[PDB]
Amino acid sequence: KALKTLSIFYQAGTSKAGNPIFYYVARRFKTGQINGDLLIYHVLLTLKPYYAKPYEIVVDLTHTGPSNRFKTDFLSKWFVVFPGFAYDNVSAVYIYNCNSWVREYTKYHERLLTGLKGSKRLVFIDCPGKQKLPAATLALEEDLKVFHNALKLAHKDTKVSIKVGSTAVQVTSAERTKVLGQSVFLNDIYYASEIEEICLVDENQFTLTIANQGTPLTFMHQECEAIVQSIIHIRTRWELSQPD
Numbered sequence: 403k404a405l406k407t408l409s410i411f412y413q414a415g416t417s418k419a420g421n422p423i424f425y426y427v428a429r430r431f432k433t434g435q436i437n438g439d440l441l442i443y444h445v446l447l448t449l450k451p452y453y454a455k456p457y458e459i460v461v462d463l464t465h466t467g468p469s470n471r472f473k474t475d476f477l478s479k480w481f482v483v484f485p486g487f488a489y490d491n492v493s494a495v496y497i498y499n500c501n502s503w504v505r506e507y508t509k510y511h512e513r514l515l516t517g518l519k520g521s522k523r524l525v526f527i528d529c530p531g532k533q534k535l536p537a538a539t540l541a542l543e544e545d546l547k548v549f550h551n552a553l554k555l556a557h558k559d560t561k562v563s564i565k566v567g568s569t570a571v572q573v574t575s576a577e578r579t580k581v582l583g584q585s586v587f588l589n590d591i592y593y594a595s596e597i598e599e600i601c602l603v604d605e606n607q608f609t610l611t612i613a614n615q616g617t618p619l620t621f622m623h624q625e626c627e628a629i630v631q632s633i634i635h636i637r638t639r640w641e642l643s644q645p646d
């Protein structure tokens with residue numbers, strides 16, 4: 403009932419600047435499955451012996467989606483449950499593996515997150531170099547087929563790379579996009595278990611419907627056939643490994 407909530411947030415290491423570092427692993431928190439107040443209380447007790455002095459936070463957003471989200475009314479609680487100095491004493495916030503969903507999440511909540519907008523303390527890490535299946539770590543360490551110069555079609559199209567592993571698919575933005583007032587790179591991660599549909603529209607276009615996420619993704623690339631075919635391959639390999 404408890405330990406299940408310590409992997410989400412914990413203290414570990416000391417910043418190069420000599421400050422205590424804390425990690426929030428976003429994908430550990432499942433809204434509805436984990437009591438909100440329990441998590442806050444955990445976080446508070448963990449920060450209590452430190453947050454009177456400068457400290458640093460590492461937000462881990464890899465594979466963060468709707469199920470990892472804070473409901474609006476729960477998000478608000480975080481803005482008033484800590485003493486004032488606790489917010490001020492945060493000297494740095496390193497954001498890791500921010501993705502398309504988080505961007506929409508922060509835009510939807512932009513009026514609440516005004517304080518973070520274009521903040522000097524928020525550092526978006528633009529490259530990773532700085533019985534339960536890991537999945538996330540396996541996906542980021544397995545061999546890949548990389549399709550560069552792809553095009554993600556949206557309100558404004560964006561250069562992206564499409565990386566197909568054996569268990570997951572990554573779409574990495576090749577050009578910066580606006581997030582909380584900053585130009586950053588995004589890295590989406592879709593487990594083969596999340597690809598509900600994958601339709602090949604033409605020789606160099608295709609769509610990708612992600613489970614639990616409304617609007618299907620649309621891409622363009624010279625070798626859309628090979629891309630679509632390899633993704634279908636891993637989706638199949640996953641379905642075959644599921645219990646009958």
Ligand SMILES: [Mg+2]
Pocket residue numbers: 466467468469470614
């Ligand atoms: Mg999800």
